Structure formats: structure tokens, C-alpha cells
Amino acid sequence: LRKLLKPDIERERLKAVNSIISIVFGTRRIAWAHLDRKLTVLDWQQSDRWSLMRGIYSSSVYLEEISSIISKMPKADFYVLEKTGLSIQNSSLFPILLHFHIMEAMLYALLNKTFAQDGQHQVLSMNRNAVGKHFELMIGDSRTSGKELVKQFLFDSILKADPRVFFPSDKIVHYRQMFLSTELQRVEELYDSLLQAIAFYELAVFD
Amino acid sequence: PENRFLRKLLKPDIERERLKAVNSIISIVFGTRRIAWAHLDRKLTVLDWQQSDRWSLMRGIYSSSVYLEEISSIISKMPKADFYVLEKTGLSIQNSSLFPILLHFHIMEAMLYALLNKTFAQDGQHQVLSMNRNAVGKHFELMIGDSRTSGKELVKQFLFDSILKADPRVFFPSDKIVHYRQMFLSTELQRVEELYDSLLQAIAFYELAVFD
Amino acid sequence: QLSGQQQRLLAFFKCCLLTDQLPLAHHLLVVHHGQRQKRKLLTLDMYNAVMLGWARQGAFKELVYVLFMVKDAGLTPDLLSYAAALQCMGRQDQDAGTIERCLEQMSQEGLKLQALFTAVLLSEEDRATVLKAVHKVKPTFSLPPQLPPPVNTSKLLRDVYAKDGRVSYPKLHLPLKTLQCLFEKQLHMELASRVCVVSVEKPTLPSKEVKHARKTLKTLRDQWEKALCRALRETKNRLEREVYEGRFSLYPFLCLLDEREVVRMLLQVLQALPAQGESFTTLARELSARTFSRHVVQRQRVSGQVQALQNHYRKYLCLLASDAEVPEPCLPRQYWEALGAPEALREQPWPLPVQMELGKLLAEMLVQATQMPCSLDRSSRLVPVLYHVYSFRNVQQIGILKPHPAYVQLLEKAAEPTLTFEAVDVPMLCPPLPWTSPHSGAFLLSPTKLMRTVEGATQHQELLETCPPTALHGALDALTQLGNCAWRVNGRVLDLVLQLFQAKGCPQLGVPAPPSEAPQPPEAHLPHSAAPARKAELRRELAHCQKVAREMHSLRAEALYRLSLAQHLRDRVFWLPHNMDFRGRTYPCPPHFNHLGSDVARALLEFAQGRPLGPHGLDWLKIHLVNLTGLKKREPLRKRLAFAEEVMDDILDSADQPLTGRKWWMGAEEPWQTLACCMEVANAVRASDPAAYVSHLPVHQDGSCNGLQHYAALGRDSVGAASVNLEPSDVPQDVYSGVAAQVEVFRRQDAQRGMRVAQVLEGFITRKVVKQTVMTVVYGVTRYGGRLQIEKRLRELSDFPQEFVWEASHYLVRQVFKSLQEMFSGTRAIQHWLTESARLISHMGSVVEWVTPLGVPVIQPYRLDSRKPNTRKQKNGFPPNFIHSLDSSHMMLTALHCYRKGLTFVSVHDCYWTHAADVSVMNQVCREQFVRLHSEPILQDLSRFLVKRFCSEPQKILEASQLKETLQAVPKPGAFDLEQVKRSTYFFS
DNA sequence: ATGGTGTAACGCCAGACGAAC
RNA sequence: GCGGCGCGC
DNA sequence: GTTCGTCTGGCGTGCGCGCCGCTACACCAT
């Protein structure tokens, strides 16, 4: 149950959470979802294509973009990031493997607002492959798109069986209209963020 | 002209007025096993100069949580300053065999940009800078072909000279100069180039950016 | 409890024994003993060291003082202490009363008199003085005289040392005096530690700027000599003042050498420093290694070991000389041990901290002393030549000493026409020293390891010293025989190869081309208006030209050194002393120019001693020429000989006009070897009596797929033995073609069965497709690697349907593995048996160890950072290493039994080379020993050995029972009769 | 001609880690 | 020391 | 604290030797 989440957090600390922020980033966009302990999607948004991954790795631009991005996020008990399966052996994917780390660096430093005083980690890295295995999205040890499953969560309501996630009535219009407005574009971060939040609650909090 | 060279050396671009209005800086140079910094004011007085040797980073693993722990404990020992200057190496996204270093440095440069810019979220003013190492070498005439030489001799000259009246380039406090000299002599047998290049980077920053 | 600082102090005291600086050791020891916190650091070995020093100088008073410090430590005197006391009493000619009291006090302490002469390190002068001291009180004390050396009683090595039999050991062609002179030339060369070779690159071009550059470099080298001398003496003064205090320093180590040798060594390292820089630590290791080495050289020079080695070697040459006889015919090792032998010892190296400190000291001194101006055209500013750069070398950042670009450009303009080699890199100019132990052999002064453990693995050597001496005798003799082979350079072949090399080169014949022939980019860049893609296109083109230029430079330098060594040895007779790897295969020690080299390297080499062709010498030379051409691989011997008689005219034309004739030799598979063979046959047929023509050319007899031959012999596989020419046949049997045919019939079976893969592979199952796979299976090819090889053999066919690589490669690797499961059932059973056995053995936390049928211990060094064993490389590496040890044993047996018949024998693992006059004999021995090797229960002895070795520790019983279960599950042999190998013509052909 | 500066796809074992007594 | 190649079995 | 079980991920023909080299390229100015 700790093979997915790093660093190691006491299971009691995980089960006492009130709300989390699930963050998934790609090479051109980043998305996040705010879910509380009642599995209610308090927020779910993504920023348009950013200015990173333009051939150069300037730390000032990363600080500006990431700061402006996390400035729009509310406060939460834990911030979950994606830990990809990229290895230091794939020289073709070195541009990506660097980018993610830079992201993962600043998010670890900028979101742990109380780490300087109490030394308690609030930013985690959740294994993407294990999130795929949880939702049975694996095909040959490779994750497929969870777009159809998110579509089911968004448009299918009472499936004559217990729901896995809840959407507030004042926000379901914005969520579904966001889904349909971004259906033609590759927005796997938007889906995998919500799926990662649900997987976090089902695996770490309510087992 | 001078502004263009000032754009090859300093990144990101900082207003020249605010740059010339600095009271004290911290020059930071980090490697794979050590990190060192020196706190110098506008009077070229070395208020502090130390290194956090023997860390748990590198050694095969790149854990962002451990990076946060180590870098946080390192910056806990640094005083407040008007600007934080880092070393900008000549490492490129090429040379595939040494990519592990280029990642490590970036991680450092990432968190140092995030943890030392304590007021950036409100005013959007950079307090962490990147100074080109090769240009610092050209400033001290330490360049041989396309490789920078050791600045240990210049630091030793700055440390162990009594004459050189007027413009000593650097000043050492009497209550700390004994500790500085004993530190230098205790690290003379070991290659601790970060310790020297940090102080040299501070002096070069003051001479090139502040008192031009 | 050994400590680093204690190591530094003990090495200081011993080094002071070397420099005869007794007052220094007494000063430091007294100061250390006088302080409370420093007295605890001293050890009995140090007091015994200074005690032995005063004993060698005959200082009774100081030795009594040291004894007082021993009892006041308070330690107790041991064997070395009483040895020092007795030595001082004997050298000073003391009265018998003090010596008697010494023997009675020694009897009261419980020490034995013989344990002193067996357990104490004393030189023959020290042993002589101690004996003279004992003979004053105990005059009838004699050390046990041990004279006879035991003869190996191994099953396979019994007849090699048994006195029953007519031996005709071969002698060299050189007389006694000439061999003694060659010994003098090799001794001088090793004492110099350097070899200068004239560079074969370009002819005599003095030029104008070169003269000025050479003058400037000479002046700078003299200035650096003076600066290095002054800085060296000043450093010795500083370290001496540090010895004046109670602290250890490297002063006596600097007092070990003639200083001028230190300066010349530093200037040599400075001249050989690469332009890009070296790791500071590795430079320190090099300076320390050379310092220690030259220290050993001067020590042997001044201690009389060189003179005693003269008296020994000159009497050893009586066995090898042509104009001298020996009392009884015997092997070189036997005669060498019968002569003396003193053997002596080598100074144990310093601790690693001493080495590092000395090396870094010398390097930094070289940095401080060497200076130069700004060069060009003296200068107002003067700067050093070496600089620290602190760059990134291999992942981790490291300090690199880098030369100034003016110094690099100065050396490039000077164009020094000479090359420098190490004394151990060039072949010996005299017959090497016979191997008598894993620590004494090969070169006369430089030590040579017996096994090729990479980077000082220390593991194997102790197990080589553990076994009984006789157990190694066999190997120790074989390595001598290969070393005593006298070689010479073929003048014609070298003249032609050089004529091509100095002009434009010829990569088609293995002659590297100069950088002048590198591909140029046509044309120069034309940026930037158009186009952004053309900048990257010309970028990649320039990258390709630089890649080809660099690789051409690599081959050009390698061949420059090899051809330069060949030229330096043109008018000389040289020897190649041999060595072993951890598994047991033999290799020459000079790596650049030797017969294990490429085609060009082989053609340059020929036997120094000739041999008359005899009745079939010329015919075997013709068969050997056809073999070198490779044009009649599949044909029997009779058709090879008839083919040679057919192309006789092209042979003679190729011999007469090599570069201007028809160039028939240039088309052969081994062109240069074919050319030299063509010259030999041409000279042979043009003699009045070809049967008497003296031939020097080596004839090869190689075993086709030797690994599969040893596997098939182990498993007694019938079909496999028929495939690798173990069964007698009128034509040579090809295993690759047979495997291709078996895979073909499987393809037809699955094609009629309905398999889609077999239908598209119709007409494409060829020998070249399965050649690399079948060949590399013996080395551990799995289904994945074999699938990749088959892919590599399917993509280039072009006439094959699109990709279809997955189905065809997977099905073809499954069918090749199955085909080998039918042809080599016992082979794959044995490979899996050894694999599983190594899996369990190494899983128990122990490396795999075994013993060859000749008594040679083999250990695998695969470990992971004591150090835990790397079980993966153990389990994957055990079978191939075992097979390699078997063919090594076969080769060594062939060498010994051929030596009993007076033949000249050399070997390339499975290629047996001899004179054309003796080929028929060698093939008769080569098979015989083979039959005698696998006739013994190799798998049974290995299984019982591993049971006694690894299934004996009563700790774990689970793995002892499962491992004892698998080890005792020896696969049953097949039906093949091994004796048939004696009648197989193409077993070795 | 030379130097400086500006710009561009599968299966198997094993090693390690975590849990359990 | 890693990397680029080359060579023997 | 040690041992056992699981899982996840890396590897998949072996040993022996030898060269060389560790931002780059183009153009403008001296």
C-alpha cells in the first residue's frame, strides 16, 4: 500500500485527510482536482498551454509559471503528484525526464508551506502505473486513456449501484461543459488527475 | 554594448537600479557532493563563508523529497540577503553520458529558486540569479583555452596578504578571519573548488554588476 | 588491529631500513615512545624493525635500548626480536655467554630455534650472520637440506615427468654466447625501464619551424629539470624537518631514489601527458607506481640479485643452447630448479595511503616547478604549464591537470620522431625466465602475474599458492614452452606493409589510411539565408566526417605502434612470454605485436628457427596456403592440394610482384598471410631439393567450433560429434549447414501443419542466417539474443516479405534451439546442469570454484558492492568458463607431448601452430591428448568435487540437500565412441 | 590567416524491500 | 573512468 | 531483529587486447 505513495506517510495521517489536490502535468499543460474526504469534487481545472518545454530550461520561467499556477489552487491537507515510469536509461526521453523533475521539484518546495517548521511532508508522488492497475486500464503493462471512464463519471448518474465520486450540483454544468469543450484535444492530464484522486481515496483512505 | 554583456552574464534580467541598490548578497556554488555559500555586503565584507559537506544526495537516486529535506536544512543555515546568486554551469542538454549531473543541478536550481524567493509570490521580483561561470573565469583571468582553471590561488592571495593597501577586493572580519583561514588550510589538501568559486563569484558579482 | 597511521609508521621504519637512515628511525621511535598518547600507537613489529636495523649495523647499545623500549611498552620479544639480537651478536662477534643466555631465555619464553629460520624474514646475509651466531654455542645446528623436487603424479601428466621414455627435447639454433648476449640486451632494456622505437610515420622531413620548436622544447626541458631538482631538494628538506617533529612524512621514500631518476620520471610523465588532461588521482597512482618500480629496479641492482641472476641464467642457457649439452635431458623448469635456485623475493608494496600521498606530492611538485612564458614570439608574462580545471570526466566531477595550449602546440610542432614503450610492452630479446611459481616468471626483473585477474583482484593468486606445487607443474611448464618460442619479423612482408602504410594506406588489406584520406564535406557551409534544415543536415554530415576521421585516427595510431615495434625488431630475434587468465587460457604478454594479432600482425611473424620441409613439408605448405585463402573450405584435403597445384602460377606471380602483379593474394580471406605463404612456397619449389628447404613459416591446424567439440565430447553426443568432425569422414562436416537443414525440415513440417510463419520462410533458410546463432550458442546465447541475431540476418535479405520479423525470428529461434536439442541433446543438458548448479552454489553466497583435470584452480570473480557474490554473472558465466578451461587443458597437454618429441609449438587457444615438417605428428598428438582428456570422468570428478566443496558446510541443510541433489544428478553420457576422434581427418584441419 | 564572439515487445530470475513473529 | 571504434578465439 | 515472501523491474553470448577523446559552428574583425 506504500509501493505507490512516496515518501512514506503514516497511514493514520492519510486516513485523517479532509481534502487533497490531485495534480497531473504533461509537456504542454497541467491540471488539478480538489476533492474532499466525502469524495466531492470541490474544484477541477487546468491551465491552457504554458511556455515551458520550448527547448530551453530557464528556472525563472518555471518559477513564474508554477507560481501563477499554484496561486489559483485552494489550501489542502495533501498535494499528490504523478511519479512517472521514466528511467534515467532512456536517452531519447531525457528532455521529458528533466521537465517532470523540475516540476516535481518546485511543487515539492512551493506547496510544502509548513515544512520549514514542522518537517512534515505534504507533497506526495503517486505511482501512475499503480493508478492504472487500480482502474484496470492496463494493456500490456501500458496505461490506456481513462477518458471513457471519466465520461461515465460525468454523464452517467445513478448506475443502479453506489457512486465512486460526487460532483456538486452548482458545478456539474461547468465540469461536463469543460469535458465536452475539450473532447477533441489531448487532455489526458485532466482525466488522470480526477482518476488519481479517486484512486488515492479508494486505496489509501477507505480500504 | 555594456547592457548586452550584462545580459549574457546575469539571468533573469534584473533592473539595473535595484541591482545597484543591493546591501548584501549570498553567492552559492553547488556540486555533486558539497554546496558552499559566502555572505558579502556592499562593503565587500565576508560576513559568512561555509559549506555543508557530506550529504545524502546523488549516490544513484533522485528523490525529490530528499532534495527538499537536504536543501531546506541547508538554507536553514543561510542568513537573509538582498539577492541570492547561483552558479550557472556550461552544461548543455547534450553529452548524454553526463545527463545525471545536468538533472541534479537543475533540481538544485529549481528548489533554490523556489525556497529563496520568499517574496516572489506577491511582488514577482526575482531574488535568485544565475551568474555565468565562464564569464566569472574571464573576469579573474582564470581561463585557459576553453576550460576554467582553479581559483584557489586567488582566494589564498585574498586571505594571506597583509600589504595590498587600498582596494583589497575583499575584506575579512577580525572575529571571523581566523575561522576562514583555518577552514582554508583545513581544506587545502582536498579539492574544494566550490568553496573558492563561491567567494570569487561574489567578488565578481560586486565588481561587474554593482560597482561598474 | 591494523590502523592507517600504524601502517604509515611501520612503512616509515622499513623504508628507513632501506635508506640506511637508522638515526632517523631511532629519533622518531624515541619521540613516539616518550609521549603517553603516542606510545599507544607503536607496535611490536616497529620495535623489531628498528632492532633488526641496529642488528644489521652491529649496534649492541642501541639494540639494548630498543629491547628496553620493548619490555617497557611493555610487549614481549618474539622470533624476530631474538633473531635481531642473535644477528647483532654474530656480526659483532660476541662471547658465547651472551649467546647462551639468549638461547636459554628463548627456551624460557617458549620459542623454537628452527621456527626462527622458518618464520622470520632474513636475507642470506642476515641468515648467514644468525647461523654464524648459533654455531658459536650450537655448532651442530644444520637447516634441513631439501633437494629433490617432487614429480607430478597426475593421471594426464604422469608421462610428462616420468623418467621412462626416450625424450628428444628441442634446442634453439643459437649458441651459448649469443644467447648470453641477448640476455645482456634484455637485461639492459629492463634496467632502463624505457624502450625507444623509431616511428615509421613519414620520411625525413626536417622543415624550418620544427627545428625552432625542438630547440624551444629542449631549453624548456632543461629549465624544468633545474626547477624540478631544486624543488625536489627543498621538498626533501621540508619533509625532513617534518620528521624532526613527532609526525610521519614521506622523506625517506624520497631518499629511496637518485633524485635525477625522479626528475627524469617527472619529465617523462610530462612529455607523455595527453593534451586533454588526466585525473589527478590516477596521475598520483602512476607516479607512485613508477617510483616503487624504479625502487625495486635499483634495489635488485645494488643487492647483487642481478649478478646472481646472471650466474644463474648463463648456466640455464646450457639446456637451450645449440653448442652446449646438459648432464641429463630435462625440462627448463627442472633444470632451472636444479641449478640453484635462490628465487629471492620482491619488496611488498606500500599501503595505499603512502602511495596516494607520495603520488600527489610528486604531482603537485611537478606543477609548482614547471613554468614557461606565453610562447608565440621573451614574453613579458610567465605562467605555469599545468593547471587544475575541475571538470567533469566520468559522471562525478574530478580535478584534471591540463597542459597549457602553448605547450600542446609546441609538442605538435616539434613532431618528435621517436616513440616510447614500457620494458614489459615489447617482446623479450632473450628466452624468458621459466615459470616456477605464481609469482616468479616471465620477465627477468619486472614481476608478472600468473593469472590475468583484472585490476589486482587478489582472489585467484592465493588459491594458486594454496594447492601443492606439483599440481601446477604442468601449467608452469606449458607457459614456459610457449614463451621459449623464438620469433622473427618477415622482412619482405614488413617492407610491403610499410610501403603501403607510409603512402596512402590500404584499408582493404588491413592497412590504416592517414588522415589525408578522410572523407571531406563538399562543400563548406553557406549559411544562413537557406535553409534552417540545411544547417542541421550539414551539421550531421560534419559529425559523420569527424566520426570517420576519428576512427581512422584510432586504427592509424594502433597500427603505427604495432608496425613500429615490428620495425624495431626487424633484425632481432625476440620471445613472447606467456600468461594465463582466470580460467586458464594462455596469452602473450606484449600486447601490441604478437601472433594472436590480426592478419597483418600474423604475417609479420615467423619462426626464428627453421626446419627442413622433408617429404611432405612443401605439400603441407600448399594445403596451408589454400586454407589461408579460404577458397576451398568445404573441399577435402586432396582437392585443396590439387587446387594449389592449379593456381601455382598465380601463387608464384603473387610472390614475385606482390603489388604490381596480378594481385591474386589480395583476394584471399587472409591476404597478408597468403602472401607470406606464397613467398615460402615460391622459394621452396625453386630449390634444387625441396625436401631439404628450410622453412620458417608456421602451419596452423585449427579445431572447427572447438567449444561444441568439447561439449559433444562431454555429452558423448553422436550426431553432434559427427557435426564437429569428431567422427571420421572423407569430407569436412559443417555444423551450420546441418542446423540450417534441420530448421528447413522443421519449416516444411510446420508449413504442411498450417503455420503461417513456415509458409513465408520457404527458400530463405540459409547457412548465413543461423551461422552467428549456432556459433554463439556455446557462449550462452538465449532465445532473445538469438532472436536478435536472426533479425539481423533477416532484415538485410531485401527479398524477404516486409518486416514479418517477430514471427520469423521467434519461430526460427525456437526451431534452431529445437534443432540443437536434437543434434546436441547432451550438450544442452550439460549447459543447463552447470547453469543450475552455479545458480544454487552462488545463491548460497559463495563464488564458483573448480579444478581442471591438470590441477589448475579456477574461481569466478563476479561480485557486487565483504562483497556479496554476483550470482547472475556466476550462473551465466560458469559453463563457458568451464569449456574454456577444458580446451586450455587440451592445448597444454598437446604442447607438453609435442615438446617431448622436439617440435616447435605455439597456440591460439584452439589453433595449433608448428613447423610444416611436423604437422602430421602434431595432429596425431592433438587427437591423442583429446581422447585422453575426455576419457577421464570430467563431469563425475567435477560433481564429486563440488559436493565435497560446497555440500560440506553443516550450517544450512536445505541447500546442502537440494544442491547435493542437483550436483549428483550428472547427465548420462551418449553412445559416441571417443576413440573415433583418433581417425578423424578434419577434427583439426 | 587566426581569434573572438554571437547564435543555434516477452518471459524469467533475482535483488531488494516490507511485513510478520 | 566512461564513451566512440578496431582486433583475436 | 531476522527471515521469508512477494513484487517489480531489469536483462537477455564470454574473455583477452589495443587506439583516441570528454559545447559547437560561423562570421566578422584585426
Coordinates of N, CA and C (backbone and C1' of nucleotides) in Angstrom, one line a residue, chain C residues 393-394 554-555 596 602 909-910, chain E residues 1-2 4-9:
Chain C
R393 N 34.7 14.5 -15.7 CA 35.3 13.4 -16.5 C 34.3 12.3 -16.7
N394 N 34.2 11.4 -15.7 CA 33.2 10.4 -15.7 C 32.1 10.6 -14.7
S554 N 42.2 6.3 -34.9 CA 42.4 5.2 -34.0 C 43.2 4.0 -34.6
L555 N 42.7 3.5 -35.7 CA 43.4 2.5 -36.4 C 44.8 2.9 -36.9
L596 N 48.8 -13.5 -31.7 CA 47.4 -13.5 -31.6 C 46.8 -12.3 -32.2
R602 N 50.0 -11.3 -37.9 CA 50.4 -12.7 -38.1 C 51.4 -12.8 -39.2
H909 N 44.7 -20.6 -28.5 CA 43.6 -21.2 -27.9 C 43.2 -22.6 -28.5
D910 N 42.7 -22.6 -29.7 CA 42.3 -23.8 -30.5 C 43.0 -23.9 -31.8
Chain E
rG1 P 40.8 3.9 -12.9 O5' 39.2 3.6 -13.1 C5' 38.6 3.3 -14.3 C4' 37.3 4.1 -14.6 C3' 36.6 3.8 -15.9 O3' 35.8 2.5 -15.9 C1' 36.8 6.1 -15.7
rC2 P 34.2 2.4 -15.7 O5' 33.7 3.3 -17.0 C5' 32.3 3.1 -17.5 C4' 31.9 4.3 -18.2 C3' 31.6 4.2 -19.7 O3' 30.3 3.7 -20.0 C1' 33.0 6.1 -19.3
rG4 P 29.3 4.1 -27.1 O5' 30.3 4.7 -28.2 C5' 30.1 5.9 -28.9 C4' 31.1 6.2 -29.9 C3' 31.6 5.0 -30.8 O3' 30.7 4.8 -31.9 C1' 33.5 6.1 -29.9
rC5 P 30.4 3.4 -32.4 O5' 31.6 3.2 -33.5 C5' 32.3 2.0 -33.6 C4' 33.8 2.2 -33.9 C3' 34.6 1.0 -34.2 O3' 34.4 0.5 -35.6 C1' 35.8 2.3 -32.7
rG6 P 34.1 -1.0 -35.9 O5' 35.5 -1.7 -35.9 C5' 36.6 -1.1 -36.6 C4' 37.9 -1.5 -36.1 C3' 38.1 -3.0 -35.9 O3' 38.2 -3.8 -37.1 C1' 39.1 -1.8 -34.1
rC7 P 37.7 -5.3 -37.1 O5' 38.8 -6.1 -36.3 C5' 40.2 -6.1 -36.8 C4' 41.1 -6.7 -35.7 C3' 40.7 -8.1 -35.3 O3' 41.2 -9.1 -36.2 C1' 41.2 -6.7 -33.4
rG8 P 40.3 -10.4 -36.3 O5' 40.9 -11.3 -35.1 C5' 42.3 -11.6 -35.1 C4' 42.6 -12.5 -33.9 C3' 41.7 -13.7 -33.6 O3' 42.1 -14.8 -34.4 C1' 41.9 -12.5 -31.6
rC9 P 41.0 -15.8 -35.0 O5' 40.5 -16.6 -33.7 C5' 41.4 -17.4 -33.0 C4' 40.8 -17.8 -31.7 C3' 39.5 -18.6 -31.8 O3' 39.7 -20.0 -32.2 C1' 39.4 -17.0 -30.0

